[PDB]
Amino acid sequence: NSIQIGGLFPRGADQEYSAFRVGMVQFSTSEFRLTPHIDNLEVANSFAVTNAFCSQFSRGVYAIFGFYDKKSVNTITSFCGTLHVSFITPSFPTDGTHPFVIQMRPDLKGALLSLIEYYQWDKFAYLYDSDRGLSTLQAVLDSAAEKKWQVT
């Protein structure tokens, strides 16, 4: 009763995969297991991800574990939304509600707002990389008016 799963891993993900490989071992039972198809791909390229997602759809997996990037994120969300494929990933949470998506990464933006309150900050600098995204920076700039912040 072997069950197949999609495995989308970036190239440099050595420990992420090292922990993934350990994950399946500690959880496989005597009546079923997991048969992942691992595609080491450059996750930023939307075409590579799109071509890789279908490389798993034709193989007929029952769920896909992977990652995504600010550029390729909207590629996976609407793809799993129409094909009813279930996608599980630790990449950053979807900006909005996108169905058939499982985000292990807990919402970091909600916790950061509470930290700045206890420290009683008023003016500070916010450093962000447009690569990782800015969904968290957007949140602190939105609440910058209600809570009196002068973000540089």
Add this chain to the structure above:
Amino acid sequence: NSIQIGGLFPRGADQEYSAFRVGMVQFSTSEFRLTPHIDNLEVANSFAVTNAFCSQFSRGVYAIFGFYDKKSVNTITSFCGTLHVSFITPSFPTDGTHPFVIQMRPDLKGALLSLIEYYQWDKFAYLYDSDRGLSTLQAVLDSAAEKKWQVTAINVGNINNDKKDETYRSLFQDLELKKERRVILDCERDKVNDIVDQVITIGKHVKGYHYIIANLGFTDGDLLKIQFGGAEVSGFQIVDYDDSLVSKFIERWSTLEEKEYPGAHTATIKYTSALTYDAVQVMTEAFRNLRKQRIEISRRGNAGDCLANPAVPWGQGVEIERALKQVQVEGLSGNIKFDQNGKRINYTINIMELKTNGPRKIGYWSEVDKMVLTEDDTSGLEQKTVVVTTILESPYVMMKKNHE
């Protein structure tokens, strides 16, 4: 004589499509002609975008004219960079240099950054919409820390239309904390008309407020509702109706029947649509130069499934890129030209101040020259009722015994 191209259109973009049809007729010669394949699809559904793009790559086109959303721009750009397929679009330019992309929309980022510097602003609001990329937001924020600006950036895009009256009143309750009187609206021409009607409801459009619409269709959206409140309104117009070329187009435009051409019986045209008419002229002259250059571009056979691994790029797409990126014509958006990346270059955005007499061509910019127009001759001397304030305190200001 037949050239195949792919067309990706939002289903709620009819004038944007009506302008495309008129362009085929005005640039159809007897030497050759272009042939479209239209798929009305959802612009935000990148899966539909992927299904539409591969529908054209399997039919074997030479270039694709379409749009994209933030949720799909990366889908369009990534396929064109690998399959060497040229893409022409009037949507927002890509956040970076992407090959085989011919962005018809010019970069507004340079305009706003010095329209701010013209009025001498150092603190303002910035209500943006992520539907057209966070490119503009990073620009103002990067320049905010350099000039020690104090900006308030609000992701006004993600708001529900059912609780729109209690949240908009709440936003201005938040913007009232700093008594903000200088705002920049960075929504599409649709959500702008929603904010406009809600600024009127709370009366935040009188003497004192000053807004800047950050899109290339100032005269497109409805401006008559906030024109007389007393608040100065600035913006940007790309379709300079003063040019005789546009008027030549607008005359033939205003007489067209509306059942056959939706959204075309009026005197103005949306900047999204005006760029589309100008897009055809680019593609027409692109291939006409491939002809005169004695260049053979026709496909050698079935392009196959787009998901072909490894992705084989047809070499002549390089020549199509070089053909499209070396076009140079004139249309409704003024001048038209492209770099080696496909970005708009050598253009002119008319800056318009909304006075009491309507949109006024006050200024304009360029990627080399910033704010350089002398004041329009039309105006009125001593039309400014200067507002003066004082305090009732005898005997400085006493109400006459017959003050009623």
